[PDB]
Design a protein around this ligand. Sequence first.
Ligand SMILES: COC(=O)c1cc(Nc2ncnc3[nH]ccc23)ccc1Br
Length: 292
Amino acid sequence: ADILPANYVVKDRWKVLKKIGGGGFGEIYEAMDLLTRENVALKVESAQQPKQVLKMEVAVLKKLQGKDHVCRFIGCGRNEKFNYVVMQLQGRNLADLRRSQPRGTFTLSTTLRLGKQILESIEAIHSVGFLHRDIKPSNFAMGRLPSTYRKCYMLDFGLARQYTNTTGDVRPPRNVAGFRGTVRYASVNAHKNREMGRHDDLWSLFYMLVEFAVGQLPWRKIKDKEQVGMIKEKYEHRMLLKHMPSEFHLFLDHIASLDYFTKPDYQLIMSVFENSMKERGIAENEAFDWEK
Ligand SMILES: COC(=O)c1cc(Nc2ncnc3[nH]ccc23)ccc1Br
């Protein structure tokens, strides 16, 4: 059963309309804001749940206000039954949009333009001293307004972790860290139980764009964490570039050379996407595949 029934009113302000998803770490609802009249997104987690992600969600979301590709923060609170975060509601997510494609693939035009936007998201979260650690298509969605439908947003921050400390320096990595995020888009370092860094969020971006353009990843059907890790360790990553723009070699070589300590060259990755667009006559004003 759902944590919240339909028509439930959170803090005499947010009326639950329907459940829109969730799964692991909690549930997400569409709610009507009775004070603003705006349809909002409401994230709730049981107060008797062992892992409490919503405190992190709020901290990162607050830090990212003013930045592009982030939901506006509406409110938050906690009671004896559940914890909640209220934020700007968006349109369809990228995993849903990709699955709705005829061949489950996007065009290089959509792939490259989403890549630019997701990369700007990653750069922004890293700029406030946090790692995302759960970069996947279902964590990104297009806007639902006429002024936002072409903009891509980073939806969740539950598995995020501060990599900087109080003084603005990079904190020492732990000798071991428990696996965080999706199994499909996790880097080989995450599979090895190593402390995740900025480069690991760029590995997830790399895998996601290959899946966008090709429609699948070699380890698509394998659910076992260890088995996927062995495939990724053994798999010659150059093979993933077979149907990708040629500048993607530069992207793969860059991330493969990084570690926890080294700041990524975000501009190098951006130039890969920009050159892959200009060399194909791809315009920034083009329509996305779902608009076709
Ligand atoms: C893992 O994420 C999902 O599966 C999922 C997430 C959302 N999340 C959102 N959907 C729409 N607007 C949102 N704002 C903040 C979060 C959010 C909605 C539906 C699914 Br189906």
